[PDB]
Ligand binder design. Structure first.
Ligand code: NI
Length: 96
């Protein structure tokens, strides 16, 4: 817990033990974790980790993760009901 966040901006909150799928965004040239909301058809949240181990940088890698989320000033083109955050990962594990 004696660790500083890699995100530039103020931590909003922590996300805990979320299930997501890793992909690479070719516009911003970054890896992210996509978490789909079971509440609706279009609500997806993308978490862009600034401390992701390169062993997870594989298309469609399924992980369970926790971390500190912040807003990011990253300019990214996303559909209407898709939002994104910077994340300082505190835990991440591959799902088998
Ligand atoms: Ni610590």
């Amino acid at each position: 817990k004696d660790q500083s966040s890699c995100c530039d901006k103020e931590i909003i909150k922590d996300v805990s033990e979320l299930t997501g799928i890793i992909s690479y965004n070719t516009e911003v040239k970054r890896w992210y974790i996509s978490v789909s909301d079971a509440n609706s058809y279009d609500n997806v949240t993308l978490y862009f980790p600034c401390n992701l181990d390169s062993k997870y940088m594989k298309e469609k890698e399924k992980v369970i993760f926790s971390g500190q989320i912040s807003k990011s000033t990253l300019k990214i083109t996303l559909p209407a009901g898709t939002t994104s955050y910077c994340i300082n990962l505190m835990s991440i594990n591959k799902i088998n």
